[PDB]
Ligand binder design. Structure first.
Ligand code: GSP
Ligand code: MG
Lengths: 166, 93
């Protein structure tokens, strides 16, 4: 059975753990428990093809170079997550991508840009800015709510499709 | 709770300099979280600082607004993951 090693990366508090737990266990974690490192494995069927998702839920960036370099080397695809109420989380995306490209030695890495917390009223990052960034990288952009499940399955399955089509 | 003695040491209408007492164990990193007092789930911002720090600046705040600030310590020990309960304070402006 094919395995996909997915790595969720982004600033602290943007919803990486809540998005992962919604995909894998189908419930919303409302408590904030900052992550050190967590792995999730689940057998799924995507577009009729059975696979195992091995998802690494990482501590918030910026991580120590030595640790970040290890999961960027082994990751096959990256969910780059910001929160639409955190402009710093959005601005930091560019350097996360540059670091993944440097470790992979490739400008073509399977990646999806995720704008999370799209259920919140008071947004500080516009969709237009994020769509323009994702287009500049040639990668998909999707807005998600771990709370309502809007876009969650689409974001992870889109990342698996990016790996399969690489 | 870890760390201890969380306080605002300097404030402007848009910024807070916060300070805390490090525990007597090695901390890998801290998370600083801030939002309006009584905010709904997810309605906050957070950033990571290295475990060597015992201060942080929070910027881009609205003048005359009540904020809740929370600090989490994270790391490892002989016992396993180090995930103590956070410490919080409230501060206006
Ligand atoms: N309203 C809302 N809240 C969310 C959403 N996603 C996550 N949250 C909330 O924000 C908080 C942080 O989410 P979490 O998944 O723990 O962040 P994280 O990115 O894993 O944080 P870290 O481990 O890097 S420090 C939690 O209280 C969670 O319930 C969302 O889509 N909408
Ligand atoms: Mg987490």
């Amino acid at each position: 059975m094919t395995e996909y090693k997915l790595v969720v990366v982004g600033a602290g508090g943007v919803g990486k753990s809540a998005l992962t737990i919604q995909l894998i266990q189908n419930h919303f974690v409302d408590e904030y428990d900052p992550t050190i490192e967590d792995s999730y494995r689940k057998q799924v069927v995507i577009d009729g093809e059975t696979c195992l998702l091995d998802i690494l839920d990482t501590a918030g960036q910026e991580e120590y170079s030595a640790m970040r370099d290890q999961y960027m080397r082994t990751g096959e695809g990256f969910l780059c997550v910001f929160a639409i109420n955190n402009t710093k989380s959005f601005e930091d995306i560019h350097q996360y991508r540059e670091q993944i490209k440097r470790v992979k030695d490739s400008d073509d890495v399977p990646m999806v840009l995720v704008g999370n917390k799209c259920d919140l009223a008071a947004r500080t990052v516009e969709s237009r800015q994020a769509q323009d960034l994702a287009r500049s990288y040639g990668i998909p952009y999707i807005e998600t709510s771990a709370k309502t499940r809007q876009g969650v399955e689409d974001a992870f399955y889109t990342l698996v499709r990016e790996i399969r089509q690489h | 709770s870890v760390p201890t003695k969380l306080e605002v040491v300097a404030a402007t209408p848009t910024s807070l300099l916060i300070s805390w007492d490090a525990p007597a164990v090695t901390v890998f990193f801290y998370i600083i979280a801030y939002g309006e007092t009584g905010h709904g789930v997810g309605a906050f911002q957070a950033f990571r600082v290295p475990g060597s720090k015992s201060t942080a600046t929070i910027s881009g705040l609205k003048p005359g607004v009540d904020y809740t600030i929370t600090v989490y310590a994270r790391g490892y020990s002989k016992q396993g993951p180090y995930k103590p309960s956070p410490i919080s304070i409230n501060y206006r402006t």
